């Protein structure tokens, strides 16, 4: 049943889209010392999962911030400076976010190829015998 | 289409705004009694249903650099500079008191 392939590729494409949006936010918030409520932005990362026990769909199970320390900068005249004159900025690393942009896009496009190829195989089964 | 186009567009638009804010400071290097404007970015998450993956960044002016400026000695009686921290009370053309 190739219709299962559609579920798996669709779940993979959804997972890559979540990863791409996470990368988009990290690049946009790699220079933000402030935040909406009260907590400095930390590089977010989606968590993929495989519930192996046919096909095993890939599901995103939540967003987890990176555990790297916040990059402290000496801005003593800044309003938000601490007692030592340090301000903290998000731990977003440019090199790894660019790799995620490349990896997520190439992984997204190859799952479309599988679904398109799997779509053809179902059609040829319909034409079998006639 | 993916909403990441607008998530990145909204960041690129704000980076231009911060660039213009820094441009005004460089255009006002020689201005008398000019306090440079500070620029930063704020992260505002898009709260709602779904995975928390979309956060916007918008620029703001948290404050100004209130440090003492570069004092120019002119030898003129009607030229004064504030020592340390302070302000001079003036009213503009609207008769509204403001510090200068």
């Amino acid at each position: 049943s190739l219709f299962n392939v559609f579920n798996v590729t669709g779940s993979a494409m959804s997972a890559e889209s979540v990863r791409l949006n996470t990368t988009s936010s990290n690049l946009a918030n790699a220079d933000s010392v402030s935040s909406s409520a009260k907590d400095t932005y930390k590089a977010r990362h989606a968590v993929f999962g495989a519930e192996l026990s046919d096909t095993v769909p890939v599901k995103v199970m939540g967003i987890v911030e990176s555990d790297k320390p916040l990059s402290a900068e000496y801005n003593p005249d800044h309003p938000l400076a601490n007692e030592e004159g340090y301000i903290y900025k998000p731990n977003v690393n440019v090199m790894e976010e660019m790799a995620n942009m490349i990896s997520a896009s190439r992984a997204y496009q190859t799952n479309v190829q599988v679904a398109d190829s799997s779509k053809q195989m179902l059609l040829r089964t319909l034409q079998m015998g006639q | 289409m993916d909403r990441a186009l607008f998530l990145a567009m909204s960041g690129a638009k704000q980076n231009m705004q911060a660039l213009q804010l820094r441009a005004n400071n460089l255009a006002n290097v020689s201005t008398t009694g000019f306090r440079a404007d500070l620029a930063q970015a704020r992260s505002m998450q898009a709260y709602g249903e779904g995975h928390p993956s979309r956060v916007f960044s918008m620029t703001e002016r948290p404050g100004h650099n209130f440090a003492q400026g570069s004092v120019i000695t002119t030898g003129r009686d009607l030229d004064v500079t504030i020592e340390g921290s302070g302000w001079i009370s003036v009213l503009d053309h609207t008769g509204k008191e403001g510090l200068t």
């Binding site: 909406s36 409520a37 009260k38 | 505002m44 898009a46 709260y47 709602g48 249903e49 916007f56």
Partner: peptide
């Protein structure tokens, strides 16, 4: 679902709400 999805907020300041 039967309930329409809620609209996102994106608040400038969370305390203001």
């Amino acid at each position: 679902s039967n309930q329409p999805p809620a609209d996102a907020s994106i608040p400038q300041d969370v305390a203001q709400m």
